[PDB]
């Protein structure tokens, strides 16, 4: 066998290089029968001349019975390292890519299994399949019906697409997203769905593939599997949906996905909750219809429960609080959402997040949520009782003092100028309640508010003149604003570009005398 077949191997190489393509066909059937046996499979594999003859036959053949027998030999050899190296050295890859264009099932089945083993275990195979144009051929085969075949073909796409921009673009250019979305909303085979979600996960980070998966109905299609038993599928759909979410802001027909994610916030799995909170904040972004729907499926309670459960974990807390901030402004159900946070015992935890160990991006988000909650008059007193005002004043002063030493950048990704605008803006709305105004004034914040009228930032001038405007409705307070030399800058801010700053500037000037 290692002695008997080693002398019969150069004989079959001569028979494969023959001029009569009837003798070549008989020889290919012989090499095929020998690849079945372990001893003689190793003999075909060990000789480069023999493998290059099998590869040469395959890409030049017109006969179908020879095509399967030759691709079947390469399939048998691909289970071995020396076989894989032989197929590679002899130009088996451009030959196998050509075979992905045949109508015969057995041939495709042999060619994709061989190419898969090559992509997985042979170095340099990935680049060779790309240069050969195998991706266009592979995506074109996603119209097939055999589930196991589709699972291998989809895995080939994952291996090729991972970390390679060019290959992601070819998949896109060749109808990839649509073909992949079709698979998710059709097949039940777990190994296919999981492998398909992995390709979609890889494609979702590409700036051009991302809006194409969305328009293919990808959000809704991935949404169909979030209730599946296997956690690997649920998790891959979630990571994909999370990557896609910042480009699905304008997508309609999202009722189901939104409702399922709200349900997912209650799971004991840390990664599911983190993703579901992240998807909800992005899908709640500037889309009034999504905002209205999340409030109607018990989203506010779910998000308050999520923040309570999370504690110091900002991976969950930041998107959850951002989702709440979006749900509490600019829509018909904002008023309901503002009350719901209170009714579901959310105010104590929201105020707690303004204090350390919470980092700057979370604090900025929480301040904006409090600004929004303060629009509801029924939240004016409970927010005061949780100690929101002294902390907002503390955040404002320290942030302003950092802007003063940096007069003569970013801290944790946030400018201190943003904390000044945010906190002064939250106090501006809180200042609508009479008791809140006494508290704000009692904190010796009027001298600071006057200093904030001189800032080069228009938005800080707007909120500063705004808080002074609400404070000035009470005569004792208006007199204190006048005694601080506020008359001069407010008269200068009357000539401003923004009509909002000028109105507030005029209102304080009026309220200080009449």
């Amino acid at each position: 066998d290692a002695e008997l077949a080693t002398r019969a191997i150069p004989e079959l190489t001569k028979l494969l290089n023959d001029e009569d393509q009837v003798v070549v066909n008989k020889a290919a059937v012989m090499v095929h029968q020998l690849s079945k046996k372990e001893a003689s499979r190793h003999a075909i594999m060990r000789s480069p001349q023999m493998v290059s003859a099998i590869v040469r036959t395959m890409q030049n053949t017109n006969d179908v019975e020879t095509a399967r027998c030759t691709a079947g030999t390469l399939h048998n050899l691909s289970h071995h390292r020396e076989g894989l190296l032989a197929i590679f050295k002899s130009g088996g890859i451009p030959a196998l890519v050509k075979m992905l264009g045949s109508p015969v099932d057995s041939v495709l089945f042999y060619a994709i299994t061989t190419l898969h083993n090559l992509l997985l275990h042979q170095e340099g195979a990935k680049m060779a399949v790309r240069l050969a144009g195998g991706l266009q051929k592979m995506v074109a085969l996603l119209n097939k019906t055999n589930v196991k075949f589709l699972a291998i073909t989809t895995d080939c796409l994952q291996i090729l697409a991972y970390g390679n921009q060019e290959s992601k673009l070819i998949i896109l250019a060749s109808g990839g997203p649509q073909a992949l979305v079709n698979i998710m909303r059709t097949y039940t085979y777990e190994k296919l769905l999981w492998t398909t979600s992995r390709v979609l996960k890889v494609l979702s980070v590409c700036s051009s593939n991302k809006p194409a998966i969305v328009e293919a109905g990808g959000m809704q299609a991935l949404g169909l599997h979030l209730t599946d038993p296997s956690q690997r599928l649920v998790q891959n759909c979630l990571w994909t949906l999370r990557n896609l979410s910042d480009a699905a802001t304008k997508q309609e027909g999202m009722e189901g996905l939104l409702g399922t994610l709200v349900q997912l916030l209650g799971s004991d799995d840390i990664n599911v909750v983190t993703c579901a909170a992240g998807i909800l904040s992005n899908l709640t972004c500037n889309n009034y219809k999504n905002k209205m729907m999340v409030c109607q499926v018990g989203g506010i309670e779910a998000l308050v429960r999520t923040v309570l459960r999370a504690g110091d974990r900002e991976d969950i807390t930041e998107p959850a609080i951002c989702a709440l901030r979006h749900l509490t402004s600019r829509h018909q159900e904002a008023e309901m959402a503002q009350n719901a946070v209170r009714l579901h015992y959310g105010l104590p935890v929201v105020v707690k997040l303004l204090h350390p160990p919470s980092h700057w991006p979370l604090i900025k988000a929480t301040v904006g949520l409090i600004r929004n909650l303060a629009l509801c008059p029924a939240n004016h007193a409970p927010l005061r009782e949780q100690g929101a005002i002294p902390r907002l004043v503390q955040l404002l002063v320290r942030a302003h003092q950092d802007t003063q030493r940096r007069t003569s950048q970013f801290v944790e990704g946030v400018r201190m100028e943003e904390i000044v605008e945010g906190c002064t803006g939250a106090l501006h709305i809180l200042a609508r309640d009479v008791h809140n105004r006494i508290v704000i004034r009692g904190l010796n914040t009027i001298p600071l508010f006057v200093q904030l009228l001189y800032s080069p930032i228009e938005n800080i001038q707007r909120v500063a003149a705004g808080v002074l405007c609400e404070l000035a409705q009470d005569k004792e307070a208006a007199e204190a604003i006048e005694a601080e030399g506020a008359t001069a800058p407010l008269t200068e801010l009357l000539h401003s570009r923004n009509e909002g700053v000028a109105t507030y500037a005029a209102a304080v000037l009026f309220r200080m005398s009449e």
Binding site: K148, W239, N282, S329, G466
Partner: protein
Amino acid sequence: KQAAVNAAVQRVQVLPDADTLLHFATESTSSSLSALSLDEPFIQKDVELRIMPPVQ
């Protein structure tokens, strides 16, 4: 200007809110795919292949 009109110009004016998107880009963070139903015997892959992780 009167007190009822001055308090009205202030009321007509509104304060907005900006909804910022969070940018996530996660592409990387067991049990083999089952082989295709073909007319070939079961050939086991070399140990070096099924023990070692795929080429990155």
